[PDB]
Amino acid sequence: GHMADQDHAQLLHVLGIENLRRGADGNTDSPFAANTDEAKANTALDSLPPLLTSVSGQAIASATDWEANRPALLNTFSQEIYGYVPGGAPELHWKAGSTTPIDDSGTSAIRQHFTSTLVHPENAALNLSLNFTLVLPKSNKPVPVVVVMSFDPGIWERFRDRMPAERYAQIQADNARWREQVVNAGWGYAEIIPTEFQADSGDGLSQGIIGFVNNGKPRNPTDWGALRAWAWSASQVLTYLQTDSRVAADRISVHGHSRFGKAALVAMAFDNRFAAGFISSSGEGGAKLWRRNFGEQVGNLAGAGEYHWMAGNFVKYAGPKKVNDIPVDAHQLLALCAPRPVLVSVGSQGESWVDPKGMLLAAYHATPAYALFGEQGVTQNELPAVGNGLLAGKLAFRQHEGGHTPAPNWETFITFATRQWA
């Protein structure tokens, strides 16, 4: 849309940036196609920022030192990468309807819809109606709940009449399956559609929650973008869930896939109340190291089509700065989740855009922070055989046998979280 283009252009003007390097293309016949040749993907890894040097420039030698550095390290991710949550972000007050059984079987599993209304003090066109759906298995005790970020299912339906049908059937089956796997494990889930909180476009940056807080004005370059706002939305659901006696307050997980996998990891790192993370095929801007040249590139995320995911400040790393200059990398983002358990998940079929091994490497290079806490992580720097999970530490990696989908790793994640919480 033209508004994304206009805001992007004004952002470059505000940072004093003439040109950005192009992003990569995904089709291999293009001159700009992404590198997928492992031999050409590691030039920048020598500038990898030292995980265990604090922002003050001291050596980090203990769990205590890592926690003392955490706010400063988060602050760098806020100003330069994902943006600050403004203090003006409001409290969400939720109203719930009645519970209804999830199916007519006589299960005691229930569904309940929650709504929060925000009236803007100045401009009613910024008003918001925000939602999540809670699903709980029946239990005599508080149950774990995974906060789930989903793609708007109105999208599968808009295109039901135009899809191969084998594939529509398979998406619908996967969508039903994880819901059943969660409940059968004695977990509930709390589902949000993130794009109802903040649109997935620069067009919407003056709308949604970012626009509400900004009174419909353009972002300053240190303000949150969409990933951080989606993570904030998940965090507000966790805040509700910790007031609900049906929920185990120390076993609220977060999950998202693809662009929501990026957001879920941002949530995991920034909100240490989340008890476990299922981070699926997140890629560039998520668990993939920026300094890998493999699949999606910084120029993709600094460009008009995806910059809205990021702080405005981030686009400088595609222009007057290079990937080598990013003050942090994805191993520090995973490290920020320590000591809490995180599964980095990716498929094996058609996943080059997210760089399976660059995510592995992020976990590998994050692990010395988990080690400070007496915990284990990822200890090899090459991909295991597909399907062989590195599942023993609090920081874990499993590449499954499928494509760009989380469905083959829900079983692994639920089992993993249960074992790591014991």
Residue numbers in the entry: -2 to 0, 27 to 445
The authors write:
The aim of the present study was to investigate structure-function relationships of TtCE15A, a novel CE15 enzyme from the Gram-negative bacterium Teredinibacter turnerae. T. turnerae has been isolated from the gills of a wood-boring shipworm, a mollusk that digests lignocellulose in marine environments. TtCE15A has an α/β-hydrolase fold similar to previously determined CE15 structures, consisting of a three-layer sandwich with a solvent-exposed cleft comprising the active site with its catalytic triad.
Three TtCE15A molecules were found in the asymmetric unit, with a Cα root mean square deviation below 0.2 Å (all atoms <1 Å), indicating a high degree of similarity between the protein chains. Like the previously determined bacterial structures, TtCE15A has three inserted regions relative to the fungal CE15 structures (Reg1, residues 122–134; Reg2, 175–200; Reg3, 399–415). Although being shorter in sequence (26 versus 40–45 residues), Reg2 of TtCE15A forms a much longer helix compared with the Regs2 of OtCE15A, SuCE15C, and MZ0003. The longer Reg2 helix present in TtCE15A builds up a larger ridge around the previously proposed lignin-binding region and thus presents a deeper substrate-binding groove compared with previously solved structures. On the ridge built up by Reg2, multiple hydrophobic residues are found on the side facing the active site (Phe-174, Ile-178, Trp-179, Phe-182, Met-186, and Ile-194), whereas the opposite face is more hydrophilic. At the N terminus, TtCE15A has an additional extension (RegN, residues 27–55) consisting of ∼30 residues neighboring the previously proposed xylan-binding region. RegN forms a further deepening of the active site pocket opposite Reg2, a feature not present in any previously determined CE15 structure. The serine and histidine residues of the catalytic triad found in all previously solved structures (fungal and bacterial) are conserved in TtCE15A (Ser-281 and His-427). However, the proposed canonical glutamate of the catalytic triad is absent (similar to MZ0003), and this position is occupied by a serine residue (Ser-304). In TtCE15A, a glutamate, Glu-374, is found in an equivalent position, which would likely fulfill the same role.
